[PDB]
Amino acid sequence: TPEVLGEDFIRDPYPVYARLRERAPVAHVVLGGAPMWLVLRHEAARAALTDPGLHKDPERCARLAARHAGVDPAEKSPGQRMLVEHMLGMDPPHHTRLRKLVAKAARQIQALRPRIEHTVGALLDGIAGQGEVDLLKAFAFPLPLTVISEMIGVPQADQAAFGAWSNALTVAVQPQEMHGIADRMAEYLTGLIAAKRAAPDDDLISGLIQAEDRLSENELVSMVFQLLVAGYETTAHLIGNGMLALLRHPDQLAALRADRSLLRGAVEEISRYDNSLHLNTLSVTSEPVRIGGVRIPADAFVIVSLGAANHDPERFEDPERFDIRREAGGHLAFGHGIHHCMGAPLARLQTEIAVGALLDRFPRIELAVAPAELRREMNLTRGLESLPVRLG
Numbered sequence: 001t002p003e004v005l006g007e008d009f010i011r012d013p014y015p016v017y018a019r020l021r022e023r024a025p026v027a028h029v030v031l032g033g034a035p036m037w038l039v040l041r042h043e044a045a046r047a048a049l050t051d052p053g054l055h056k057d058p059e060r061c062a063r064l065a066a067r068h069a070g071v072d073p074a075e076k077s078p079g080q081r082m083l084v085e086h087m088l089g090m091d092p093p094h095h096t097r098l099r100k101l102v103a104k105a106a107r108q109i110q111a112l113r114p115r116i117e118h119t120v121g122a123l124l125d126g127i128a129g130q131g132e133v134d135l136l137k138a139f140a141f142p143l144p145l146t147v148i149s150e151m152i153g154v155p156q157a158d159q160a161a162f163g164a165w166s167n168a169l170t171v172a173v174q175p176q177e178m179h180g181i182a183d184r185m186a187e188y189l190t191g192l193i194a195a196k197r198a199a200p201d202d203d204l205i206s207g208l209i210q211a212e213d214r215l216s217e218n219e220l221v222s223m224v225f226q227l228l229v230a231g232y233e234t235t236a237h238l239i240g241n242g243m244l245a246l247l248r249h250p251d252q253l254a255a256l257r258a259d260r261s262l263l264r265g266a267v268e269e270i271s272r273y274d275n276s277l278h279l280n281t282l283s284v285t286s287e288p289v290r291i292g293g294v295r296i297p298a299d300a301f302v303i304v305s306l307g308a309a310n311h312d313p314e315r316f317e318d319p320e321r322f323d324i325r326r327e328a329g330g331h332l333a334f335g336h337g338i339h340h341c342m343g344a345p346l347a348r349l350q351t352e353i354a355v356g357a358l359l360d361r362f363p364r365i366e367l368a369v370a371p372a373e374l375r376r377e378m379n380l381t382r383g384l385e386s387l388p389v390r391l392g
């Protein structure tokens with residue numbers, strides 16, 4: 001019998017991961033009305049992330065997912081193509097080409113730090129004296145929006161409105177509204193490319209065009225999109241997940257206040273504890289695969305649980321405990337294998353420089369509501385909806 005996963009799972013997963021982790025390293029679950037297999041233990045997850053039998057063909061996925069519901073029916077619109085023609089929806093040998101090209105774009109790697117520190121201080125200089133504030137909508141969500149945007153070259157006057165469409169496509173559930181919102185951005189993210197094919201500047205759009213092979217408009221849009229959205233939501237959610245733990249456990253907060261030698265290691269324990277992504281990109285199966293010692297059939301969905309793996313009592317000690325002073329090296333929070341977050345270095349830098357600056361200016365940073373008045377959203381992205389901190 002396939003176990004069913006409900007609204008309770010979405011909000012509070014890590015208990016469920018722990019109940020099923022002891023039973024077996026992989027489980028048969030029902031997430032989204034879709035029977036899939038869930039990889040929970042650390043080694044099993046590492047291995048499922050290094051196996052070619054797990055294919056990321058969104059084309060095959062959608063048709064297979066519609067068949068569970070019975071609805072068995074094209075002109076793929078711009079926005080439909082934007083959502084499915086990025087690295088994460090592609091398998092080798094075609095993934096290798098794309099990842100080469102996007103990495104070939106530039107010493108823009110350096111000077112990323114100055115930008116972050118600048119925009120951090122700008123954001124922080126605005127909330128000073130404002131008493132109680134929502135840290136998420138004033139520091140966390142504003143920062144990566146400004147950081148990733150200036151890398152891609154999204155003009156300042158256009159940055160914020162792109163964040164709303166990002167946020168809405170995240171909150172949106174129905175396919176219709178998604179494809180509609182996506183067609184909206186896809187057009188803007190085409191003039192933005194077009195301006196830069198005529199005005200080569202010092203941004204990542206200009207350099208993605210300039211990279212033999214080249215990246216087609218199809219993949220230039222798709223890549224400029226994926227870097228924008230995934231470097232906005234998941235980055236900004238890691239900050240807010242991390243600060244909730246840094247405010248929920250106060251003893252460690254003050255250790256980090258005096259000793260900035262802990263700043264580096266804490267970021268790893270933030271990613272390890274509550275990561276913004278506790279789940280893999282779905283992947284279907286071309287052939288029968290053996291992961292965790294359990295046979296997974298062909299034409300069957302497989303997701304890897306990055307949360308349960310990070311919380312496996314074999315890999316880590318008291319895996320459900322926030323200790324900024326742990327050998328947390330080895331987390332699967334940024335993925336493993338051919339995929340693996342290309343922009344993980346930027347996520348660590350943002351959080352590292354963010355958390356330090358918050359503690360620097362504000363030594364009375366504290367939560368202004370009971371931990372009970374805080375509520376998490378119904379997304380596979382572990383979010384908080386609100387973080388009402390009380391600076392002092």
Ligand code: HEM
Nearest residue numbers: 087088227231234235238280281334335339341342343347
């Ligand atoms: C704290 C922030 C982030 C976390 C926790 C995170 C996590 C992940 C994970 C787990 C994957 C692999 C998914 C899978 O294999 O199913 C991934 C992929 C990816 N991420 Fe991130 N990510 C973060 C931020 C970013 C940022 C800021 C960027 C900026 C460009 C980015 C760009 C990418 C790309 C391009 C891939 C595709 C990997 C591939 O297909 O080869 N991510 N991310």
